[PDB]
């Protein structure tokens, strides 16, 4: 019953003409609820979950103002970092930032995050205590010194431990119907004969939420990872997730193999067998 709020920002410079492409998205747990895309016509923060549409015009005005200001900061940063790294004005570069908070089952502050990347590599991040900085190279160190002088960490801390948690709690209440509902995976097994000697058993988990899940195989009650293939968890497109794990087995020995499913929506883990 623990939860998270996270915002993700990507800015990509367009050296030939104009301002960077800027995309911002907000999530509660695994549910996107807001977006901004600099390429879109509205130039507004837009809703992406029914429960945020409950918020009034003042909310949308404030979030639009803020997200536009965020876009300007990253635009400036793209130029600054180009300078720090002594790069030409010719190439496209990328900055990425993620920030937000985790709460426990009590819906009180557990952890905060504020991290930043340049061209896909760690640049600077707040440490877990939210009081000091991890800078990856001497360019990031220039930013660290600046942010230390300006007491940036203290301003960020206050949001992460306060405002972030307060609004997460509001969203969790307002979106109770979905955000506080767990969708247990719908499970089944399939079988395919590859040869006279070999068969594949595939254990499916569908339509689950949240995305976190564990799928494992056992042979005669012992963990089996050899001759298995596990795909990365993928979105169904309706807010839920999918995953499968497969095992290659001697034809005729299917009964030895059991699939094991762990998910927050299941009281006890599930055990499946080929019938």
């Amino acid at each position: 019953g623990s939860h998270s709020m996270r915002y993700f920002f990507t800015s990509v410079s367009r050296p030939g003409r104009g301002e960077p492409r800027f995309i911002a998205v907000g999530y509660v747990d695994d549910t996107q609820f807001v977006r901004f895309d600099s390429d879109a016509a509205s130039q507004r923060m837009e809703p992406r979950a029914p429960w945020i549409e409950q918020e009034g015009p003042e909310y949308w005005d404030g979030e639009t103002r803020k997200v536009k200001a965020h876009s300007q900061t990253h635009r400036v940063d793209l130029g600054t970092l180009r300078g720090y790294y002594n790069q030409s004005e010719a190439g496209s570069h990328t900055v990425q930032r993620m920030y937000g908070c985790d709460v426990g089952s009590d819906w009180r502050f557990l952890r905060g995050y504020h991290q930043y990347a340049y061209d896909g590599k760690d640049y600077i991040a707040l440490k877990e205590d939210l009081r000091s900085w991890t800078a990856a190279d001497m360019a990031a160190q220039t930013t660290k010194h600046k942010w230390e002088a300006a007491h940036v960490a203290e301003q960020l801390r206050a949001y992460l431990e306060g405002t972030c948690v307060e609004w997460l709690r509001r969203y969790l209440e307002n979106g109770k119907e979905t955000l506080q509902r767990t969708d247990a995976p719908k499970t089944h097994m399939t079988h395919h004969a590859v040869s006279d000697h070999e068969a594949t058993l595939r254990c499916w988990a569908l339509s689950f939420y949240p995305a976190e899940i564990t799928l494992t195989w056992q042979r005669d009650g012992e963990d089996q990872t050899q001759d298995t293939e596990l795909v990365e968890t993928r979105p169904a497109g309706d807010g839920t997730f999918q995953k499968w794990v497969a095992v290659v087995v001697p034809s005729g020995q299917e009964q030895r193999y059991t699939c094991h499913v762990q998910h927050e929506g299941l009281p006890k883990p599930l055990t499946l067998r080929w019938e």
């Binding site: 915002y7 803020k66 900061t73």
Partner: peptide, 9 residues
């Protein structure tokens, strides 16, 4: 809700 402000790097 987003942060009120972000300082430049």
């Amino acid at each position: 809700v987003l942060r009120d402000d972000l300082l430049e790097a």
